């Protein structure tokens, strides 16, 4: 019982740390790559139009 709770508090701390300092860079990184790929598709589309 006590062990579970304490490791659950530890997991809550880990989740807070990753959400505050690890999630922002990675999610947004993937996000920037996403923007890039979509805009590249866009450039291809435009060139086709040209």
């Amino acid at each position: 019982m006590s062990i579970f709770i304490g490791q659950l508090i530890g997991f809550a701390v880990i989740a807070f740390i990753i959400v505050k300092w690890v999630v922002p860079p990675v999610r947004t990184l993937m996000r920037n790559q996403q923007e890039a790929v979509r805009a590249a598709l866009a450039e291809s589309a435009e060139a086709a139009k040209k």
């Binding site: 006590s2 304490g6 490791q7 659950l8 997991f11 701390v13 990753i18 993937m30 598709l41």
Partner: protein, 234 residues
Amino acid sequence: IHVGHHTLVFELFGMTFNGDTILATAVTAVIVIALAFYLRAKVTSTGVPSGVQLFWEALTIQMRQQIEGSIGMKIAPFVLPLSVTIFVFILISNWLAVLPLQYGGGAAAELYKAPASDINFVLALALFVFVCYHAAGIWRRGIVGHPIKVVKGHVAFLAPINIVEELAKPISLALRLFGNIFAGGILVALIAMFPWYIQWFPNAVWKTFDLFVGLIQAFIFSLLTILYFSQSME
């Protein structure tokens, strides 16, 4: 600390099996299969990639760059799937241990124990990679040609050393992965001896960095697999 002690142990075909390790490996396998199937359903060449598509694309690009930079992709097409699967398998195995699946017996028990903490898992992956790149060397050099190059290596008069380094390739590749995760399984157990009001701090700081440690270990395992292939093949 009860180091060892696999639960769910059973016996079949006249040999013993650690049930808990098999369960953890199956959980990791189903997570990886779910990721693969979700990619397959939502893999888009023209549309905006999903999150899983970006993850798989980044991993495949990294491993393809590693292969191309060490042994041509024309020579080593079969090693990219091997690297990607090794990386994801080890990564998910290690990261699934970060979930709060640890409770108290009165010793500490853990519903999901990282499979790499068991010697069988890491030894299986290491020996599979060992057989795979030795078979690749045999294919690219010949049944009799490959052992001669393996013994000779790059310096002939260092023949015994090579024959050791070769045998060191699997062992280290296994044990390097074993001790890193096995050690963690002990730390979380050791940290369990603390009371709940101070247990969360060492546990949190350990597992937060264990995320990165498992990522680095999966990366190292895959990278050294690619490197050994490059070597054994030419």
